[model samples]
Target chain A: DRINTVRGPITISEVGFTLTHEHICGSSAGFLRAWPEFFGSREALVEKAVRGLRRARAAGVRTIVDVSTFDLGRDVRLLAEVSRAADVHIVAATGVWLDPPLSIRMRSVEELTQFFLREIQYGIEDTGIRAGIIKVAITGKVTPFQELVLRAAARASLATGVPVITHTAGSQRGGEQQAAIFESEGLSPSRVCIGHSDETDDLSYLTALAARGYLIGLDRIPHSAIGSRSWQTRALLIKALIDQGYMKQILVSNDWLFGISSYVTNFMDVMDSVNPDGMAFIPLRVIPFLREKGIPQETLAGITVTNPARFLSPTL
Target chain B: GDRINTVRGPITISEVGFTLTHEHICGSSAGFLRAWPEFFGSREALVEKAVRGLRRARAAGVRTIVDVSTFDLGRDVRLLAEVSRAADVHIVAATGVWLDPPLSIRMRSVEELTQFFLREIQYGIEDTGIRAGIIKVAITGKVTPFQELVLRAAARASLATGVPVITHTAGSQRGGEQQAAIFESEGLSPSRVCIGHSDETDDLSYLTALAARGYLIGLDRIPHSAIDSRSWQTRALLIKALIDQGYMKQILVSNDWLFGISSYVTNFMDVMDSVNPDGMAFIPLRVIPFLREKGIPQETLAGITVTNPARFLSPTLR
Candidate 1:
């Protein structure tokens, strides 16, 4: 009855080649508040996001859950426009990110949960685009404010049935904390995807997390160049998880940003330093490489299509 | 009548023995640490450094130390917990935004910042399971709009949580008087505030004015060879003067020693070498003995190190 997306709903089974975690544009709230015009005309920024999203659509991405929370500058109107232009399903997220506004950070969990619920049940800000997922992030460790926010997200997930994607500092192994809070609040691990799991290369840690039965986002494949764990390391971790027979527990994404970002100014310099494939790197490169390593086609299909749908589906 | 929350847990006011009211096991910008973690080196190495320094402070008879390292300035509670246990010292962790918090936090109104600090005090700092015993704030120069925002927030946090507010003065600005004025305006007693680094100057008139207003004067820098003409003897004489004036119960002392800090400077050790490089031992090893030689009575010293801190740090909430 509910197949929520930015461009309106479709049948659950029709979702294909989904990116469970990624962002089209994520600017800091400070940058938005102080210098919104620095990123250039609103139309130009939307055009930039459109060009990148359309490229991914051509690469067979049917849906992408934009996990840019409020602090990360979630522009739902811009998102809806990009969805229409790129001809893709942009599932917007509602929740706070690592850098929360001072006003939002002070709110109690009860108030924050209500804020998240309104976005999901109605529409984000007044844009008429319903959020299909909830997102939250933590610093290296969980601050009290951070924990309350995580619990708030858990309550929202339980009430709305929207899956939650988390940002984690893998070195700190914060996913365990996020999962524990969500699970304790009566949300199942199946409804959670611990993102940035690719930041760490420890299989023991990776499998131990999967043992709790939630999806692990091997997102941030492009982020590997930033001196995080390498792509080969992530690919091998994926193979090891599959070998351990945790086939349905994996989700893959690039966590890519297509143009200039919040901290950086130059577009060409960013691409010159990182890989040029952008969002297509996951579908075009990583999958084929995994298949070459003797990963079964069905397993790869499940990771891209089936496993994502299972995680994204509210009915689950 | 009140309790102090330490890394170990809450303790009775009497249990807050001989507190060095201001010190840090580590202090740096969080971004600096994130960018150059190698500066602090391994976590184990840092814990070891802190253990040795704090144990040294403990050996000098200081029992409780308030680590006023703010969030933006590398307040690692995990590391703080490890140090507190290894050193066998009671460390009262602080909660309050720092001089340069994240842009979002900076953008928030004073009331918003106040609630954030109060939440940390009422709840806990991060997931450390240890609550803050004090609220730390700083004013860089003449009270800028931003500094006023932080000072007001700290005052509100202290009022709500009953944790005393400790501050850092860019001492050259003689900002402690302005700080005391602001807190008093917020309906906070001077007893609920510690005007820090008051020892940066030997201006008895300035320090005495704040002490006279019932504010706890933090003569917190010792073995110091930085700004102002104040020396160890000058600080001791000032302490003797305050004791002579019977404001003995209003004085708090410390070395403001940074035990395990890593800076973004090219040669961080050189910068460390410049500040209170003698570390936490300066108080127990140097100042108290020097003041004793200056004819300051032992009872007066105990009042500063022991009795005063207990009363000053006791939460008014209870």
Candidate 2:
């Protein structure tokens, strides 16, 4: 079956130029919950969001997978609003982000699994908008909290047959650990995508992750701030992966946000301070650069289209 | 009149004692505070913890320590003074910058920077009454225009003030040769500078070449977990080789550590279950015994630990 998105489940072939990972609007759940007014009114956010999606669509982005977790401000109704206005399909996520907050941290793995399972199947917040995929992340070292949340994510993905996307500190080699956990959970490695793989220049480690049969996310294109390699360096690695016949395991996107998130009060200001080029970086800079480096049009097509369509599709 | 500035005050060269030539009490990159201030947690909590760690190091027979934190990396000489008074150990503060300096600092002219470091040595750092005893500069893999500017400025400051110069490098790149060559051209002797983080490689030829040029080979990465570097075993073996070649007089051993770095808290859990306060303790406890067993004489250990540092930091230009 095709993946369930905000616009409804569509055929895999219809998912053209799919960005396997991205965020139309991400906010901090802590502030949004406590202050409620921290992000100001819904009308202003909707306005800012419509413009961002329109810009992406203008750049030829037809579908986007918003991997914003609950803690990272995943709003299904808001996703529906943005998707409809921009004429783009957004595959919203239903899982925890980074470290699980104290509220969820105290819960058992079975309990957390049940909670995530409900979100994927019955739909998040009763909006009838099912989560298309699961999102999970971990910092450099996996504490007990990270382990428990990841176990729950794997369990939920196996039960519901949804694809799982992960955020990993690539330098710490956490992606390999996540792969092993998903493997042990009886979840097919093909159903998982390890994210932030572009944070390292260690091609052997990246190719090793791809060799495990899961997808790799070179999501932070042009983001060399946290000591990640440049997109130019990543292009060479992508070419190397394709040469080694691991093209099917490759996915590319910018985990870039288009809205002011609650974590940083002035989100765009912080983004401008570090990565001024913003989400337009991949399309405007990296894709052309990759093409110049001799990555065939078909290879680029596979990364942006067929691969995402196949991975996001539900096998159940 | 001629003395190196300690955190306490100016101290004669004879009172320098056994010194760890390179280390940091607390720090993060310049962008880190603005980017991830939450990672810093609490300032008071960090300071209190540093005080406790300093006292512990003092108890472990560490007589003096050189805090080589560059400006971007949080060189808090005022805090160093407080920690020094509480722990009763001599803390030599530094005036310099790291690779990831702030944009404002990076955009300054070489003459302006040299003048600034001179003021830091001659008067004091900013409004703080503590003057820096040493100058620190960092080179990653190669020298960029930014690095060259800071290096020349550091050399000029050292030449004018008679302060010792220390450097940070990946060691495998042999940035020391470049640094030594530049400082030599500036009329500063190789004896005045110590090439830091040189323990990252086991290649004796690089170490030998730098030492042959009269530069001190800083074997100061006792427990540094640089993501793309070699193992600690290689560093230990390299030390044995340098000593075997009778170059012990040019060695300086220390742990190039930042105690508050949350990332290192769980790494190396094979031996430690928490953030190892044993950063300063590693050289005395583990490396010292290992090198002694490898047949390095006690006198050689004393030279690397005590006498060598004292001689190097004695303000020769004055």
Candidate 3:
């Protein structure tokens, strides 16, 4: 089975050392398009992003899932350019964020389903690059519009055989509610990856979702300590989940951005200083820490490589 | 020579009577209005509702209204013009960014931002050819670097265009003091600036310090429970204290009422209405009557509502 990438379709076996969740860029909706200069020149941003991806590739990260939706300023051409330049497979996403635009809010569920389906099947905008995954998000409790997008993503996945990824708010255990909605829409747990699961320290929450066959995204590995648990705490949680026979459900990545608008440029710079490795944090830092904790190298490979491949592989 | 720009065109300073120094005709999170026009309802319906509200305000002797809504808060100059024309009241629109500035504005240099504001005040907003009358800026907790940049830009734009500046301050934090200091450093007169949300604090000394420095004190945010800690009666007492201290000419009172907003969250208007049932008529129907009962004569109330805004809004240069 093959999975889609920004460069082209690649076999599931090529999805090695996958980073399941991350963003290349994020901005207010319509901001980048309206004022590209405000974010710096296109060539400069693309070069900066390519440099980061190249470093990740050198560190053995073969594929990256850019989960930025249109509201987050997802640029397919930029993804394609960087993917080609950096010799990495970039899987783009099609869906909405927590705050759906009014247009999305006003649409019927079926209409929204088709909106995602069009992006997945045909292409995003005029670009011929197809989306390999569907992205959806929920806050503490799902709003009506949020539930609508979630149901739409579920239906889109069911129709297209593409996998679903979700952004769950921290400590809200919003993943459980997201899983329930996907299940109610008749999606199997195996087809969804519950993202930002690391934001919570509750082992039961992780074990419960993983036990049901959902992928647990221990993303945000190298984030600042303010809103996230420390990396040491997160590593122990991952090891605990592995000890409980859920190693296959673990996927790790740093939810860091390569380029962002100047509104948060200073803040993100401070974040970069805290976790200087950027995308390679998982490969250089977390894997070594797990090795020190007696987790074998093969087990880490299975968790990072085999698990993402299985989750991202098309339904056959 | 002494006129200010209104949505209906320039009006003599004397025509600016019974003004609400700070209020929003319509507001929402940035980009909601452009992306979701229906969020507020049909344009005609939104305009009609605004017109009805303005007519009631006019009936209550509101001859001029300063709409301090910027592009970030969904300022619509065309709607302001339509409502002003229909309601027969002068509506003054503003230029400059608010609380959550777009990345474009944040990244731009102060000179670039000042030019952006000057274009709106001199030429017009977008293609409407409806110029802005005032410069509006805001500060969150303490002033961040980006916020200081915006404040400096607003001060420079006020100097260049001669339009007075109105500010949204985190009044509880005494954000107005920071704003006044920045404006003073830029050599903009205190009289050219109105420090908004002054009622958010009962620190009479704080209000007195700013007002004593000749900054127009915005006793706005009336009946807003979240912003104002004092009861409505206590708010009136604070107003009377400023009046008693001989700062009557420097005090501007308004409800900071938002007539319509994009219904992102539930019950936004319901909560606002629960606190202020009279809506735009709260000042005229409720506060003025209450102030009268507290022995604040009608004339003092008129100066706060009318003459003060007129004096503050008059353009100091051509």
Candidate 4:
């Protein structure tokens, strides 16, 4: 059953056009992403960039958290302005980006701790820049540093009374460590979200983290390269994880964006190919696809919308 | 109308600005209270040496070290006057009674003790341009009515004057209940009382429970003092236990390595005796590796060591 037993006066079915996670019109770290193309102008670039957002908006995407995080350069100012302009709930966050090969800021724990708290509290009190979620980019291996960042994010959440969104490097250890950290920090499981499960398909590993009080973000969608790509294989992973009795602790969002680097290998085209239908294929169609392959309706709702919506809800 | 953005809790000290929490350049219990009953102790040593001690604390990152001294403990604000020119670390002095044995013998009646604290608190508490930023309280192996009354009175005074209250619990025993019950009985809000000396308790249940109840729990363990103490082990283990229990809401840590105005008195356990007097941290750097081996992650450690405390201290401090 859907486990958002605490989200009052609201139910899963009530979330009509829920986009559990997504970037809005532009990157808050705007001009930085322009680096490879830094000299480009927004007016000259407006049409092209607006195409993707406008298309998605027309497709009925209502709300999404800018999990772009700090390393990605979260611009709350731009986000607030865009949300007003686009008419979408642009919930920004205080995210910890992956370190190494990423060079996310090296602020001391106290320094980062202070920075995140200020940003979140600042946004919450002044502008409508609500702290929708906190992002933890679990990069590098399971180092003390990554764990520190996770705790920082969770700590910020606890202090500010918000939810967390964590990105684990291709290892379940990061996720497991997050759970243990929250346990020590006294942060409840419902306040945390552990991203990137398909990066590792160990059913047992995934289950343990879930049981430890974290919502597993199997966000990358069905990648045949990681495992068997047939709908059955994808269904197998999703079904077993749920059957292991962890469906309620699951969230499905695609780390799908067609940036320029993706274009080099023509991956951009494939990402661009992810029409509204393809976006829903695994989430929406995957349900029938899984049931046809032998799952159930309740489990489908758990992964498809109920659980995802709960991850996005403010009061949960 | 006061529009300047506040960076930390107010430092209402006028000229001769020296806001310190606790510090001592180098001191010992050597002739602690000066043995001869005929001699009156001078703040000269504490005051003179502090001329430099005050500067060092500023460099190491401390602005206010609440002397946390109590029981007729008069801080030669004169010493503060001397150090004020050298640096900006304001040493906050206290007025509560210490543990039962020594100070308790000379301790006042519950009414007298509370009144003494109130009078001193008022001296630095009210905006008479001469009040303290916070008050301190203490508890023993078990609860005593006098201590409760003292806490209640401190709570009342603090509530009225914006002074935060700090409490001490030896070896972390009964810390949560002792602190919480006193606050509730005395009609004190948890936000005002900082449950101190929690480094001794290994139970997150106690710490988090107090924190959840609204009173701030100080996990402020000084690693150097706890060197080789099972308390540190229990401390780390309890952190893991609490995460599983989901109690990250109430937590804050400090190097409870008290820099002396007095000296090491007595402790409940032999382990407590092993603590290093130098300002050292509890659960040192290796705590991360140990947690890693036990399957606890970095993110989690940051919550206790950094995140939770940062949150606890900010805003209120901010």
**Candidate 2 docking: what grade?**
incorrect
Q: Considering summed lDDT, which 10 consecutive residues are worst modelled in model 1 chain A?
A: A29-38
- Ten residues in sequence with the least summed lDDT for candidate 1 chain B: B30-39
Give the candidate number with the greatest TM-score. Answer: 3
Per-prediction tally of clashes: 1, 0, 0, 42
Instruction: Give Cα distance to truth, residue B127, candidate 2, Å.
Output: 0.7
User: Is candidate 2 or 4 superior in lDDT?
Assistant: 2
Give each candidate's fraction of reference contacts reproduced: 0.01, 0.00, 0.18, 0.00
lDDT by residue (tens digit), candidate 2, A215-313:
988877656663445567866667778889899998888777766443434555666567655655666677788799888999888888889988898
Off by over 4 Å in 4: A1-17, A24-61, A77-88, A99-104, A124-128, A170-173, A222-232, A258-270, A273-288, A294-299, A314-316, B1-318
Q: What would you estimate as the lDDT of candidate 1?
A: 0.76
lDDT by residue for model 1 (B77-114), tens: 76788788888889998877666565545666787678
Q: Which segments of candidate 2 are over 4 A away from where they belong?
A: A1-316, B29-38, B225-233, B262-277
| All candidates: DockQ | 0.03, 0.02, 0.11, 0.00
The best candidate by lDDT is 3
Task: Give the TM-score (vs. native) of candidate 1.
Answer: 0.55
Sort the predicted structures by lDDT, highest score first: 3, 1, 2, 4
After superposition, candidate 3 runs with Cα above 4 Å error: A1-316, B41-44, B225-229
lDDT of 1 at B237: 70
Ranking by DockQ: 3, 1, 2, 4
Models, CA RMSD each: 17.9, 15.0, 9.0, 24.6
State how far residue A99 of model 4 sits from its true place (Å).
4.9
Q: TM-score (0 to 1) of chain B, per candidate?
A: 0.93, 0.89, 0.95, 0.64
